Amino acid sequence: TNPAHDHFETFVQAQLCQDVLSSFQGLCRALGVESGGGLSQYHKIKAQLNYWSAKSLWAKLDKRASQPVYQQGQACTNTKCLVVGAGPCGLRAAVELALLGARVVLVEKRIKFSRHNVLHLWPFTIHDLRALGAKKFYGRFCTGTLDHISIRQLQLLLLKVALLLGVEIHWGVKFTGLQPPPRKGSGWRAQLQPNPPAQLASYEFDVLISAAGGKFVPEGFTIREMRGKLAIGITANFVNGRTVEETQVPEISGYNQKFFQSLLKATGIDLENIVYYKDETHYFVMTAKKQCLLRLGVLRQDLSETDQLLGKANVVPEALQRFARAAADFATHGKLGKLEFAQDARGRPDVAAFDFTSMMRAESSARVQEKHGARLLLGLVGDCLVEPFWPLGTGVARGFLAAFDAAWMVKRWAEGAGPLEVLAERESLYQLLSQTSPENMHRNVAQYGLDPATRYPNLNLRAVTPNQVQDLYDMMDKE
Numbered sequence: 400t401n402p403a404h405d406h407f408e409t410f411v412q413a414q415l416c417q418d419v420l421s422s423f424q425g426l427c428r429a430l431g432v433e434s435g436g437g438l439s440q441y442h443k444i445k446a447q448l449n450y451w452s453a454k455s456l457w458a459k460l461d462k463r464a465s466q467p468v469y470q471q472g473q474a475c476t477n478t479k480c481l482v483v484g485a486g487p488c489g490l491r492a493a494v495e496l497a498l499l500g501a502r503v504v505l506v507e508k509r510i511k512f513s514r515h516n517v518l519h520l521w522p523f524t525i526h527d528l529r530a531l532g533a534k535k536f537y538g539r540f541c542t543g544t545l546d547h548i549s550i551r552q553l554q555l556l557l558l559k560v561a562l563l564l565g566v567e568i569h570w571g572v573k574f575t576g577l578q579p580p581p582r583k584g585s586g587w588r589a590q591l592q593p594n595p596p597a598q599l600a601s602y603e604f605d606v607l608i609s610a611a612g613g614k615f616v617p618e619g620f621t622i623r624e625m626r627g628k629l630a631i632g633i634t635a636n637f638v639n640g641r642t643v644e645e646t647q648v649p650e651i652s653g654y655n656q657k658f659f660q661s662l663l664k665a666t667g668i669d670l671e672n673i674v675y676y677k678d679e680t681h682y683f684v685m686t687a688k689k690q691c692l693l694r695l696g697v698l699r700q701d702l703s704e705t706d707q708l709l710g711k712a713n714v715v716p717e718a719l720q721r722f723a724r725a726a727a728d729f730a731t732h733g734k735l736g737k738l739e740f741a742q743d744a745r746g747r748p749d750v751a752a753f754d755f756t757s758m759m760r761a762e763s764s765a766r767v768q769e770k771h772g773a774r775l776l777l778g779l780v781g782d783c784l785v786e787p788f789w790p791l792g793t794g795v796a797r798g799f800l801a802a803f804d805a806a807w808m809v810k811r812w813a814e815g816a817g818p819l820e821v822l823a824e825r826e827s828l829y830q831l832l833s834q835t836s837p838e839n840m841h842r843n844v845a846q847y848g849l850d851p852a853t854r855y856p857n858l859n860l861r862a863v864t865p866n867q868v869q870d871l872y873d874m875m876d877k878e
């Protein structure tokens with residue numbers, strides 16, 4: 400028996416964060432390496448696992464790692480990064496920073512991956528993930544014509560790649576701000592809760608990537624919010640027994656129908672849209688009008704403030720359950736048989752209401768701060784950059800594009816391009832993000848890489864100039 404093989408194989412199949420971490424530590428012990436140790440550790444792990452279970456994975460990862468943009472792991476070798484958030488986007492960003500050869504530490508306030516809701520994937524992201532070994536880590540990955548994945552499964556497979564690539568991850572620690580350089584010769588550090596170990600507390604970095612999700616409010620960044628017409632989203636997960644009969648039930652990708660009237664007549668349910676993905680669960684997302692929610696007992700009081708309206712006190716869980724099951728049942732014409740709610744992490748029926756009204760996007764995707772001669776590049780990636788409207792399925796795509804554009808920006812930074820040029824180039828790319836679609840991007844997704852010219856047709860990297868981004872560079876002194 401071979402402990403390294405045993406731990407690698409457990410690591411591959413692990414379905415819980417704690418199991419991924421513990422099997423990875425066992426693997427590191429067996430192979431004479433450390434976790435969080437950069438590409439040198441990746442090289443030592445893979446050299447020692449040239450065998451049936453692992454061979455195909457190293458082939459894929461080495462293929463990506465060999466793309467010219469990474470300069471064989473030397474592009475950012477003097478760059479130190481802190482990534483905030485182990486969501487799909489912060490993990491995807493870290494993988495990229497790791498391939499560039501940067502030192503990558505990532506902090507995440509939670510300690511498990513608990514979300515089961517299902518995310519739509521554009522063709523480029525499906526290729527992207529397959530090319531990182533998704534099939535090895537997740538046997539069900541975008542099989543057939545399926546183009547979606549549950550959040551926690553996406554997190555698990557990206558966590559595994561990040562770990563193999565030597566990203567140093569800390570859990571149960573909340574990024575709360577920055578400790579500015581105290582004097583010349585000092586670097587930037589993070590404010591973290593609760594008190595972290597000497598190494599983390601004193602960890603200095605020149606790049607901060609914030610991928611902390613929709614509710615994180617980035618400091619120094621201007622955020623644009625528009626409150627539109629009230630819209631209330633509801634998501635639900637039902638147990639999928641994966642029977643032959645259940646598989647026949649067609650998905651619903653997304654009133655342009657007589658359907659919504661016939662739904663309203665039969666049930667009293669007034670919807671604007673409904674979506675059904677056949678994933679690890681039978682997952683539904685729908686947008687409901689407030690008046691039918693009040694009428695059907697889902698909402699207790701007609702409160703004018705949306706966050707009170709959709710607050711825990713105003714939502715009746717039993718009525719929300721009847722509402723979601725009745726809509727899902729009607730939408731799929733009963734062909735899923737008797738729907739049973741899947742359980743959330745806490746053991747409750749997995750159904751929830753969300754504010755679909757306000758859409759937020761950062762005014763800029765990056766800033767630079769300098770104090771005492773120490774420069775810090777700050778980048779936003781994922782939901783904290785632009786909040787996705789879930790039914791339209793742009794979340795993973797635009798999060799990953801933001802992750803790529805941030806990493807390219809870090810390559811430019813590492814080249815010594817200087818704060819204003821780095822920001823102007825990044826912002827020229829950012830102007831495109833909310834208009835992106837598969838249709839208007841480069842068609843050859845197999846050739847997508849960090850270089851934005853691989854991804855964005857007829858690229859104007861000067862759409863924004865150095866002079867226009869001056870306010871994004873907070874140079875506090877001349878040191």
Ligand SMILES: Cc1cc2nc3c(=O)[nH]c(=O)nc-3n(C[C@H](O)[C@H](O)[C@H](O)COP(=O)(O)OP(=O)(O)OC[C@H]3O[C@@H](n4cnc5c(N)ncnc54)[C@H](O)[C@@H]3O)c2cc1C
Pocket residue numbers: 483484485486487488489506507508509514516517518519550572573574575610611612613615634684780781782783787788789790792794795798
């Ligand atoms: C509860 C929930 C349900 C969702 N349901 C759907 C859905 O049904 N369909 C859909 O399309 N999209 C859904 N989304 C959005 C989808 O999950 C995201 O678009 C996708 O995961 C990419 O987001 P992200 O990685 O930028 O941020 P997130 O997935 O939000 O990840 C952010 C991470 O940062 C961590 N974090 C936050 N603050 C800090 C801090 N200060 N310090 C350290 N770590 C921090 C969080 O714990 C989290 O792990 C949902 C999101 C949530 C939060």
Ligand SMILES: [Cl-]
Pocket residue numbers: 414415416417510511512513
């Ligand atoms: Cl978990």
